[PDB]
Amino acid sequence: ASAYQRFEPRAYLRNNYAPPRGDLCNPNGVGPWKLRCLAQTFATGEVSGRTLIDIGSGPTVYQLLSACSHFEDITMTDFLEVNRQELGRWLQEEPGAFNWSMYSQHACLIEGKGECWQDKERQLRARVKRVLPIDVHQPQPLGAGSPAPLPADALVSAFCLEAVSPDLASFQRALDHITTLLRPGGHLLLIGALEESWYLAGEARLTVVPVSEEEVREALVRSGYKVRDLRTYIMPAHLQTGVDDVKGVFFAWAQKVG
Ligand SMILES: Nc1ncnc2c1ncn2[C@@H]1O[C@H](CSCC[C@H](N)C(=O)O)[C@@H](O)[C@H]1O
Ligand SMILES: NC[C@H](O)c1ccc(O)cc1
């Protein structure tokens, strides 16, 4: 909470969504891997509905590129005002917005529906109805009278939980807190850092709870999820850059037992 007060959105984006990690040309990169996971999951047609909430969006939109064409009402969220402002600069196409075109383009490449990236970015901007404050540590993450339609048909969260919890236990409770926003039989698409303990965002150094695949699986189960899919990406040497000590990245497709 206090450590995140020095969090620099532009530095975070630069560290993880600009070359080399942000160079989507090589199919073995972490970016193409994450977009592939999201695309294939939605391509199954099993994850559908009207509303969807993205937990701890930070200043990024890539995690919703394949999702947007499946839900008409999308809520983006984040603990920091600076992030929500950054998200606004892109949704409004204001000056200085981050350029996600490489991710939009590759998402279109992977979905293989012959869509142009401008049409995809346009659908996302159109379907994002609101960017709200959020605290996964509160039993009621989005407050009491939130504008977001609850319960959501689906949830998506990337690099949030493990990046905001001191240990596994806090991680477990955080998952429980956001799981309350999801309707029974709903879907959760969780992406996160494997065995990572810190990552930089400008002047801020954030602590991370190093989690493993089994620990992530057991936690989803303990929260009442049937794990539909759970994949791991080992961070290659070329993408280890000193902005963190991440070892891998996991993707989980879990359905709320209900
Ligand atoms: N208590 C809390 N509850 C929810 N989000 C929190 C939080 N404390 C910090 N955060 C936010 O969690 C984010 C982690 S960075 C993740 C950004 C994006 N989802 C991606 O895929 O890269 C930051 O934007 C930070 O402000
Ligand atoms: N906390 C996010 C974590 O540092 C991270 C984010 C994105 C990556 O590609 C790799 C690692």
Among all bound ligands, the one having the nearest atom to the CA of 191 is 1
Backbone angles phi, psi at 154, to 5 degrees: -155, 155
- The Cα–Cα gap between 93 and 128 comes to 13
Question: What CA–CA distances, in Å, run from 207 to 48, 193, 227, 234?
Answer: 34, 12, 27, 20
- In this structure, the residue with its CA closest to atom 14 of ligand 1 is 160
- The Cα–Cα gap between 57 and 77 comes to 5
CATH class of 1-258: alpha beta
Interior/surface letters 54-93, b for 16+ CB within 10 angstroms, e for the rest: bbbbbbbbbbbbbbbbbbebbbbbbbbebbbebbeebbee
Task: Could you list the beta-strand ranges (E) of 5-72.
Answer: 51-55
Output the CA 60–ligand 2 centroid distance in Å. Answer: 12
Residues flagged as binding site: 12, 17, 56-57, 62, 78, 83, 135-136, 158, 196, 244
Instruction: Record the tokens describing residue 175, joined without a space.
Output: 């998952």
Among all bound ligands, the one having the nearest atom to the CA of 17 is 2
Domain boundaries, the chain: 1-258
